[PDB]
Amino acid sequence: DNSRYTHFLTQHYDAKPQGRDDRYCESIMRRRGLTSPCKDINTFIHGNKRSIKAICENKNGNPHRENLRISKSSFQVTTCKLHGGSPWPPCQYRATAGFRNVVVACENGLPVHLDQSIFRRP
């Protein structure tokens, strides 16, 4: 099924955010059910969805490491880094906006995993 794809979209896709500041992270991390427990780091990709799906085709992706895919095009993104100890609510986050290509895992032609290591920074 496409449950992992729709799940990928739930944790990593946000078409048109308004502000990509700390408050945006705290608000969207709650709405996307990533606050129980608080996910430590999570990145959202912005833009048109067709571009992200495209990462699994040749027109916007290259093989990467072992069974991963890295996009040819760059995407606006916002990485939300947990700040504070507790893995439980309230979850406090620091946002960092960025613009670069992304690394995903594809399945049945659809993105089903986002490799956070490329945005990973304490």
Q: Which helix (H) or strand (E) holds 44?
A: strand 41-45
Sort strands 61-64 and 93-100 into parallel, antiparallel or unpaired. unpaired
Residue 14 in marked binding region: no
Preceding omega of 17 cis (within 30 degrees of 0): no
Which conformational region is residue 64 in: left (phi greater than 0), alpha (psi within -120 to 50 degrees), or beta? beta
Q: Which of 35, 43, 27 is nearest to 81 (CA)?
A: 43
Tell me the residue type at 10: T
Burial (CB count within 10 angstroms: exposed 0-12, middle 13-18, buried 19+), residue 90: exposed
Does the annotation flag 80 for ligand binding? yes
Obtained via which technique?
A: X-ray
Is 12 an active-site residue? yes
DSSP state of 72: S
Give me the resolution in angstroms, 1 decimal.
2.0
103, 26 contact by CB (below 8 A): no
Q: Give the span between the Cα atoms of 96 and 2, in whole angstroms.
A: 29
Q: Of 115, 111, 122, 101, nearest to 43 (Cα)?
A: 115
Neighbours of 118 (CB within 10 A): 17
Map out the domains of the chain as residue ranges: 1-122
The values of phi and psi at residue 6, to 5°, are -65, -30
User: Which one from 7, 12, 46, 83 is the annotated catalytic residue?
Assistant: 12
- H/E segment holding residue 78: strand 75-82
Collapsed DSSP state (helix, strand, coil) of residue 116: helix
List the CATH code of the domain at 1-122. 3.10.130.10
